[PDB]
Every structure is written in C-alpha cells, then in structure tokens.
Design a protein around this ligand. Structure first.
Ligand SMILES: [Zn+2]
Ligand SMILES: [Zn+2]
Lengths: 97, 49, 60, 50, 60, 37, 50
C-alpha cells in the first residue's frame, strides 16, 4: 500500500490544489515522523509505525503547506499522550465506524 | 484566514488544505498563544485535559 | 502583567509565561523512563501498596 | 499480638519502600512484541489481597 | 492597540508592530512569533540558490 | 487533578475476542442445577 | 576564580560545540521494539543545563 492509499483510511486526502505539484518525494523522505535527535521518545510509534507513520507524515506535510513562504522540512516533535495511546484510540474509532 | 488575534496578517498560504487538516494545521501553529492567553484571561478548568 | 493559573506567578511578558507553562506545571521527567504499558502497572502497584506507608515520627 | 505489633512499628529504624522494588524490576528490557509480559504479570500478582 | 508578545512593547498599528518584529526580533526563536522564522528560512533559500549557479553560471 | 487520564484499552482485543467468542460458543455445554437434576 | 575564568574565556581559540556529541550519538541505529533505549537515557543525563 502507498502512503496516500493507507492514509485515506481516516479521510486524510490530498487537496486538489496540490495536484499540480510533485509532492510525492517530499512526503516520502522529507516529513520526518521520528527524527532521533529531536523527537521525544514518548512519540515513538514502535511496531504500529507500519500504518502510523503515513498518518503523521500526512499531518506534517499539511501543516508545512499551510504556512506561507518556502517549503520547509516537517518534523513531529512530540505527542502529549503516548504514541501507543494515540494508536489505541485510532483503532477504537476505526472499529466504531 | 487573513489575520488571527495575536498573529500577523497574511501568514497562511492558499495551499492550506480544506477540512480537518486545515483546522489542525491552523491550531497547531496557533497553539502556544491560545494556551498562554487563555490562562491569563480565564479561570482554569476543573480537571486536567 | 501576565499571570499563571496553577502557581499563579506573574510575568512581565506573555512569552515568559508561555515557557513557564511549558516547563513548571507540565508532566514530570520520570514518566519518560518506560513505556505507558508499564507505567500504568507501576502506578497501580504503588497505589496498591500505599497501606504500608511509614508513619511519621510524631504519632509513634 | 496487635499491641506488640504496633509498638514494634512505633519504635524501629527500619523503613519499607515499595519504590525500590519497582526501580530494580523496571531496569530490564524486553521486546514489546510478545503477547505476555512477565514484568506486568508479577507487578499484578505482588499486590496484597484484602 | 497591539503588543509585541515578546518584548511587551505596545504599538498603534499592525504595520508598526510588524516592522518592529522584522527589525528587532530578527533572530529570536519564540514560538509566539512566526515571521522571523520564515524570513530566516528565506535566507536559507537564497543560500541554496547560490549553490545552484556557483556550479552552473550564465553565459552571454 | 486527574480523573480518567489513564484510561485506554489495556489488553489485546484479538485474544479477548477469540476468548469471548469461544466461551460463548461452548456455553451450551454447562452443568445442570441440582434442582433440575 | 571567576575573574581568571572570564579572562580565559575572553581570549581562547577553543570553541565548545555540544552538537558534535549529539550527532555522533543519535545516528546510531537501534531496534525500536526494546523497552529501554540507552541512547535516550544518556541524552537525558547530559542534556540538563546544556
Ligand atoms: Zn505557574
Ligand atoms: Zn518586541
């Protein structure tokens, strides 16, 4: 599965306005969901990263595209709750709908 | 939006995504000012968030 | 002047208040020692054994 | 027996700290991929009944 | 009126505040301020632009 | 200060679902009461 | 002692850059499934008052 293919499972899609830009590689290797030297370890997605990382990358690139000016590297720095708690709640919501 | 309270006008690009994504990105940038300002202006809520 | 809501200290600028809110009344550093799946168990254990609490050297 | 037990507790330099046991146990690393974690298991068992 | 939420100075217009932010707090990193960071990013952008033509100049 | 901030799912749902279904399926095998017997 | 220390710091070609150590450390690969990562701990030890 591709990044967007899996990220759409929670209705995270690509805006039509982006369809004229080469966003692929940026989302692939410029939106760090876990930079070792910056992220707090609490945000470490661990094994669920296989399906967690695309979601975080989509959120990161969305924020980066939001601000004006040149495109900058996007990095997750912290999740207030543990990444495990976030994954658990997401699984609950996925099961609910 | 053109200008939020406490911010500077024209800092949001047109490529801002619609829907929840746009909301999240806006709030993420706006986070710290809101939290600090709320503390000064309003009494604290009754149990942790 | 700008003020806190927990310790209710006062600050000359909003920026100084923000960093205080991000540093004083935040979570403790010891929480980061282990995974939540363990920390909850640790918390349960300590709460369970609170009855063994040592009495103050005044009642004795 | 109760009276003597209280007296002993009242006067003794010995102190019991459950934290010391938790600190020692939690030093051990293990994979998060196993369905069963002994560390969680023993901590659940150690608790007093009643 | 408007306040510079870092140095706590007051200003009559958003223009005056913005000019103060660009000029005075040119290198600050407080999260409450955005524009100095973007300007800083633009400066990085230009430096990369130099790296382009420095190994690919323009001929007449 | 805290009320429910420690609340999540605290066990693997797959195992519990498998367990719960299994027990329910074999629930018909259970014993009779002495009155009925 | 403060006087001499400031004088020393005033004139010295030596420069202390904390980043070099973190870069040398953080780049070490490790499995994410272990419950304790020594990298995080050692960072947490020398990070305070950085
Ligand atoms: Zn405070
Ligand atoms: Zn200022």
């Amino acid at each position: 599965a591709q990044l967007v293919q899996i990220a759409r499972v929670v209705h995270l899609s690509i805006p039509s306005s982006w369809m004229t830009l080469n966003t692929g590689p940026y989302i692939h290797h410029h939106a760090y969901d876990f930079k070792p030297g910056i992220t707090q370890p609490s945000a470490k997605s661990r094994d669920k990263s296989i399906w967690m990382s695309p979601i975080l990358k989509l959120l990161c690139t969305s924020y980066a595209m939001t601000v004006a000016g040149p495109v900058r590297t996007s990095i997750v720095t912290e999740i207030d709750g543990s990444a495990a708690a976030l994954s658990g709640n997401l699984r609950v919501w996925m099961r609910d709908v | 939006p053109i200008l939020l309270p406490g911010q500077t006008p024209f800092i949001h690009s047109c490529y801002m995504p619609p829907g929840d994504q746009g909301m999240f990105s806006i709030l993420n940038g706006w986070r710290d000012w809101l939290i600090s300002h709320a503390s000064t202006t309003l009494p604290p809520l009754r149990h942790n968030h | 002047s700008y003020v806190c809501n927990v310790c209710n200290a006062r600050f000359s600028t909003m920026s100084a208040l923000s960093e205080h809110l991000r540093s004083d009344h935040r979570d403790d550093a010891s929480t980061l020692l282990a995974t939540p799946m363990i920390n909850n168990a640790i918390r349960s254990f300590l709460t369970a054994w609170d009855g063994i609490r040592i009495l103050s050297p005044d009642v004795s | 027996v109760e009276a003597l037990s209280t007296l002993l507790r009242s006067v003794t330099p010995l102190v019991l700290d459950p934290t010391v046991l938790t600190n020692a146990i939690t030093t051990i690393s293990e994979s998060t991929t196993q369905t069963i974690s002994p560390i969680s298991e023993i901590l659940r068992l150690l608790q007093p009944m009643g």
